[PDB]
A and B are shown apart, each in its own frame.
Chain A
């Protein structure tokens, strides 16, 4: 936290597709350390995707993720007149993580009864370009531009 750069965990890759991104998403989904339950949820979502917008559900998921990956976000920094929301660029891995988080939030903000279903729907929405996660991303982008003044307070 102070001493070193503190490396990223190389997540043990997936089984159904062999993708680390997939694993990451599963992890994000999972609460209370119940991976199997979440992994199952993810696979249900995938199945739903396959059923509906008849495409390879991994690819769709990836597309969705890409759609919600931000480039600019507003870090809170104090420069005198209390704190300023200060727009800065977001690092790749970090950005990905953020996107995943947002996606998960969107999924578990959605109306319908069951999570797997919700997740699938969210993914579809992201792929399309609309809905929760994407909206969040848009908001964040706006915040970055509506504060672009302060940009020069690069950390």
Chain B
């Protein structure tokens, strides 16, 4: 059973390990999501730019198979695939209404793991 909308939101979560693109309704109910490992790419490639792009494309395709047309790109996390993913989405024929950043930066919140200190 499908629901259909023609409009919505493309949440791109770009980590350095992987890029995961969830495509979801204009409110934010997950329609179809794609990832690095989703499109076969398991390992380092998972969060490579090309992989991210591929994932984005896949997600777009899936959305299109729900009649989805006009998306709202929301980018979270800086990673290799955030720009590439965006580009892919743009290419897909999916009407990207706005590309909007939403990086979840703590307002000097609680302590990172040792790796993400040193730079403190």
- A46 to B: closest C-beta gap in Å: 44
> A81–B50 contact, CB under 8 A?
no
A152 within 8 A of B: yes
The count of chain A contact residues (Cβ–Cβ below 8 Å) is 6
| Closest residue on chain B to residue A84 by CB atoms | B44
How many interface residues does chain B have, given as a range? under 10
CA distance A148 to B44 in the complex (A): 13
Among residues 6 to 53 in chain B, which have CB atoms less than 8 Å away from a CB atom of chain A? 41, 44-45, 48-51
Which one of A149, A151, A152 lies within 8 Å of B41 (CB-CB)? A149
CA distance A148 to B53 in the complex (A): 11
- B13 to A: closest C-beta gap in Å: 19
Chain A positions 117 through 155: 1 when the CB is less than 8 Å from some CB of chain B, otherwise 0 = 000000000000000000000000000000011111000
CA distance A112 to B120 in the complex (A): 70
Chain A positions 90 through 106: 1 when the CB is less than 8 Å from some CB of chain B, otherwise 0 = 00000000000000000
CA distance A37 to B99 in the complex (A): 66
> B50–A151 contact, CB under 8 A?
yes
Among residues 20 to 76 in chain A, which have CB atoms less than 8 Å away from a CB atom of chain B? none
- B57 to A: closest C-beta gap in Å: 13
CA distance A150 to B44 in the complex (A): 10
For this complex, 10 residue pairs linking A to B, each with C-beta atoms less than 8 Å apart, are A81-B44, A149-B41, A149-B45, A149-B50, A149-B51, A150-B50, A151-B50, A152-B49, A152-B50, A152-B80
